[PDB]
Ligand binder design. Structure first.
Ligand SMILES: COc1c(C)cc(/C(=C\CCCc2nnc(C)o2)c2cc(C)c3oc(=O)n(C)c3c2)cc1C(=O)SC
Lengths: 416, 555
């Protein structure tokens, strides 16, 4: 029986217009699932039909979460979000909990359904317009409008920020060390316990939020691990071939943009002279001393590398092959704040685009936990291919921004 | 007897703008008699109404007499009112595609054009449709009028008309799953697969349902003949095609003579297999003025001649049947052209088409096929609601070798290999490790920025060397020329070391055809080879071999 008697005043960004994004084609099974879903949301009064005087439109489609096979409706509010008044609550925006990424265990909860219990500001309801497409333009498109707080909007979390606070006091007062954070329709719960008493402690927070008028049964388990930024290693051999040293010099020559102290003069000397590529070249005294000094520079951290809340995060992804991918996150070129290596998982090892899409989702999640915000991706796939398949493998309620790289990176291996 | 009203749609002018204030055009004595006559009955019906001097808004009005036709018709000019009205959700974007329809035993057409005015207008907006009727010799005040219904020519009339027509038909289409109703302007298309007796029976239930809102329809006569013409098509009881596409037998082809033949061949291409428009589009891709007699390349004459063999024997497409599967076949035509036929039954094409490569510097077959496939996938989702199963000209092994090694993520939906005329394949494949026993060629090139003079050469582990002088060249060209020299003087297996990031990029993309003859020559060489290992090393640092050749190619 949770429902605010009033609504919070909301407007668009100073001198900006509502969205008018075109709806893309959907498969016939997705159309039937959206028709069923929307038929019920209308009766629950969550949404309502609208006339043509409404020119605004936001994309919409259908996915399936982790467990449940039943269809879910996801609305792309990217355009609406950047046009929506960056909500500057009078109580400020919760300073991102720097304690979340240090916790040994974090759990993600879908409290999305808690939003549909709060009414939307009458003068804004027309900006949440969306259409359910029809096959072959046979019939005109079914149009709707939201009456409550729409999942996927950047305003829903903020508006509900007030109620959420008190719904968590009877738990936050009990367990001090536990850290709780929220993003979009997700709720993140970290702790320093162990899987035994961490997994059950969550069930406690589940029933608790259930008694406050509240897909409300899902959760993803993850453990932020070692090396925020993985070290860079140099081979350790007993006999080097001209080719091996040629790749070594290439790797050091690249690292030097990161670490200014690296020297490759004594290693280039062994290379002077046209020799066969598979021939063994004995290392010299100076050579091994330099390879020893360089190896030390790499053990230490990079030069002062800090995070700037004002600027946005970049995320590159390289395809290493055999189901392996690498990535880096940053704001300034050669100043990584995070590097990793998402490995094989359910990609059937035959679908490249499914893997990429799971990598993008995984890197985004991690990103929300460290800086409280999503990164702008630079995907290694043609724009056409990506726009045709992405949605068939997406499962998150949010969507990041992205761009496409069409030039083969020379470093497809120094990140290996 | 009590007819229920048609809910009104609240309207508004653009935020911050005001109504129209345009002057009236001085009409002739005869015209005025016409307009007065017209505006008289229209006021009776309900269409319009007289207004006092309050309304400051005015819209021009004319009257035209359709040549060789009795009587006239007024024509109000809302050009200005439109530029001051809000926006509407145009649901009239694109029409169905014949190939997506499903045959019906019976199909009728209702004319609801007469109800375009039975649709009330917003009360607080009528004051914007005001217009004046000048009187004889202007020795009296012109008669004023405002509309009470959807004006012919106003921005949002179609939009309001369609939304209202839908809401009314909704209940009916819900309780009659055995019939289908397409809506498109002044015509309602109903159809169904059942007894010719029961069909005309449910048609009356419709005509009568439309009665409950007042809307009346002109029903009588019979306009039956298979030659149904609709939006450029020619529909039949169980097949379709494009209206006769007449190939202009002209001798002097100007710009519009070909450009109007481009948009016209592209239209015919959705059913006639093989149409080509590359050599023709490449003749006006960048010409001056709208028209101009431009000579046709010898290539734009042999294909246009194959157009008169394809456009010779009329071809017909069938209709979609949900039960059968949906197949798609693709073929390679050359010059970056590909064709596709989509069907369910052998020879019974539902539709056909083409794909043109994207304009680029380098490119390969496998990349193009993928592009063609993604394009067919999206088109099928649009027309049939599902992805078709593919029949392609590429071996399963060729595809696996490709995807597993391409630097990008790529994917093709369910498909099968078809062993037709040509076959997309991989021309060459670079090694992953150096080759033992192969000569190693350290290459390098360089040019002078001003004189445009460069050198390109190489040195090997066996003592072989070479340096060739060049004139009018850049650094990029010199780095490629060097890779080429090595590829010509080396045997069947070779190791190549370069410091050219530019060269590596061109080759790691694995192109099999290019714009630059220099890159094309390299390809031809890569193809003859048995194993080639391309390695890279940083520049202007002691790698040697690259450092020794680098010296010989400088100064
Ligand atoms: C039966 O197969 C059809 C055939 C052959 C033709 C048409 C006609 C137009 C197609 C465009 C409308 C549409 N779009 N989606 C759908 C759905 O319908 C059409 C056109 C004219 C000018 C006609 O004058 C006539 O007297 N008839 C009868 C006409 C029929 C419809 C169908 C149908 O299946 S629909 C019920």
């Amino acid at each position: 029986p949770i429902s605010p008697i009033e609504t919070v005043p909301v407007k668009l960004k100073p001198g900006m217009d509502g969205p008018k994004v075109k709806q893309w084609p959907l498969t016939e099974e997705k159309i039937k699932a959206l028709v069923e879903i929307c038929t019920e949301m209308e009766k629950e009064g969550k949404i309502s039909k609208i006339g043509p005087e409404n020119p605004y439109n936001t994309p919409v489609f259908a996915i399936k979460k982790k467990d449940s096979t039943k269809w879910r409706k996801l609305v792309d509010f990217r355009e609406l979000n950047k046009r929506t008044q960056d909500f500057w609550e009078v109580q400020l925006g919760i300073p991102h909990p720097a304690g979340l990424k240090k916790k040994k265990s974090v759990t993600v909860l879908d409290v999305g359904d808690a939003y549909f219990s709060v009414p939307l500001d009458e003068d804004f309801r027309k900006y949440t317009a969306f259409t359910i497409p029809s096959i072959n333009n046979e019939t005109p498109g079914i149009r709707y409008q939201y009456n409550v707080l729409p999942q996927g909007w950047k305003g829903s979390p903020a508006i509900f920020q007030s109620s959420m606070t008190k719904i968590l006091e009877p738990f936050k007062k009990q367990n001090p060390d536990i850290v709780i954070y929220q993003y979009m329709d997700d709720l993140y719960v970290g702790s320093d316990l162990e899987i035994g008493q961490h997994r059950t402690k969550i069930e406690e927070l589940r029933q608790h939020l259930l008694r406050w008028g509240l897909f409300l049964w899902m959760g993803y388990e993850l453990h932020p691990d070692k090396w925020t930024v993985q070290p860079i290693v140099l081979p350790e051999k007993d006999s080097w071939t001209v080719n091996d040293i040629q790749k070594l010099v290439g790797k050091l020559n690249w690292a030097s943009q990161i670490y200014p102290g690296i020297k490759v003069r004594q290693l280039s000397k062994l290379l002077r002279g046209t020799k066969a590529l598979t021939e063994v070249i004995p290392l010299t005294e100076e050579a091994e001393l330099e390879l020893a000094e360089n190896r030390e520079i790499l053990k230490e951290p990079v030069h002062g590398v800090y995070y700037d809340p004002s600027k946005d995060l970049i995320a590159e992804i390289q395809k290493q092959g055999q189901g392996q991918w690498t990535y880096q996150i940053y704001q300034e070129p050669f100043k990584n704040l995070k590097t990793g290596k998402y490995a094989r998982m359910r990609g059937a090892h035959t679908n490249d685009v499914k893997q990429l899409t799971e990598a993008v989702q995984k890197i985004t999640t991690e990103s929300i936990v460290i800086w409280g915000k999503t990164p702008k991706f630079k995907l290694p796939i043609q724009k056409e291919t990506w726009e045709t398949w992405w949605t068939e493998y997406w499962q998150a309620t949010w969507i990041p921004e992205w761009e496409f790289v069409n030039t083969p990176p020379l470093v497809k291996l120094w990140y290996q | 007897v009590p007819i229920s009203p048609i809910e009104t749609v609240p309207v508004k002018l653009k935020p911050g703008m005001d109504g129209p204030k345009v002057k009236q055009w001085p009409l002739t004595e005869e015209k005025i008699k016409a307009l007065v006559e017209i505006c008289t009955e229209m006021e009776k019906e309900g269409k319009i109404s007289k207004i006092g001097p309050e309304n400051p808004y005015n819209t021009p009005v004319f009257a035209i007499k359709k040549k060789d036709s009795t009587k006239w018709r007024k024509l109000v000019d809302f050009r200005e009112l439109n530029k001051r009205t809000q926006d509407f959700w145009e649901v009239q974007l694109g029409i169905p595609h014949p190939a997506g329809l499903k045959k019906k035993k019976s199909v009728t057409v209702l004319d609801v054009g007469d109800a375009y005015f039975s649709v009330p207008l917003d009360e607080d907006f009528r004051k914007y449709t005001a217009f004046t009727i000048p009187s004889i010799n202007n020795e009296t005040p012109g008669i004023r009028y405002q509309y009470n219904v959807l004006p012919q020519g106003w921005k949002g009339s179609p939009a309001i008309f369609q939304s209202s027509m839908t809401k009314i038909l909704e209940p009916f289409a819900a309780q009659n799953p055995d019939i289908v109703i397409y809506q498109y302007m002044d015509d309602l298309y109903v159809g169904s697969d059942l007894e010719i007796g029961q069909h005309r029976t449910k048609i009356e239930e419709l005509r009568q349902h439309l009665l409950r809102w007042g809307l009346t329809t002109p029903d009588k006569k019979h306009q039956k003949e298979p030659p149904f013409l609709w939006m450029g098509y020619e529909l039949h009881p169980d097949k379709w095609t494009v209206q006769p596409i007449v190939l202009p037998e002209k001798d002097s082809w100007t710009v519009n003579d070909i450009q109007k033949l481009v948009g016209k061949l592209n239209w015919a291409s959705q059913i006639y297999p093989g149409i080509k428009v590359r050599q023709l589009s490449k003749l006006l891709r960048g010409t001056k003025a709208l028209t101009e007699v431009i000579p046709l390349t010898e290539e734009a004459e042999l294909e246009l001649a194959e157009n008169r063999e394809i456009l010779k024997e009329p071809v017909h497409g069938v209709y979609y049947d949900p039960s059968k599967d949906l197949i798609a076949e693709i073929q390679k035509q050359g010059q970056g052209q590909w064709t596709y036929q989509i069907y369910q039954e052998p020879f019974k094409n539902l539709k056909t088409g083409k794909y043109a490569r994207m304009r680029g510097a380098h490119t390969n077959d496998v990349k193009q096929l993928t592009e063609a496939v993604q394009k067919i996938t999206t088109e099928s989702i649009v027309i049939w609601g599902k992805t078709p199963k593919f029949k392609l000209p590429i071996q399963k092994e060729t595809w696996e070798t490709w995807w597993t090694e391409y630097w990008q993520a790529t994917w093709i939906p369910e498909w099968e290999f078809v062993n037709t005329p040509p076959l997309v394949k991989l021309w060459y494949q670079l090694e992953k490790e150096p080759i033992v026993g192969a000569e190693t060629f350290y290459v390098d090139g360089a040019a002078n920025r001003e004189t445009k003079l460069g050198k390109a050469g190489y040195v090997t582990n066996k003592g072989r060397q070479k340096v060739v002088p060049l004139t009018n060249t850049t650094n990029q060209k010199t780095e490629l020329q060097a890779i080429y020299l090595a590829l010509q003087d080396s045997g069947l297996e070779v190791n190549i070391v370069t410091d050219s990031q530019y060269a590596l990029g061109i080759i790691q993309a694995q192109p099999d055809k290019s714009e630059s003859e220099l890159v094309n020559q390299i390809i031809e060489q890569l193809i003859k080879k048995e194993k080639v290992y391309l390695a890279w090393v940083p520049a202007h640092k002691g790698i040697g071999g690259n450092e020794q050749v680098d010296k010989l190619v400088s100064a």
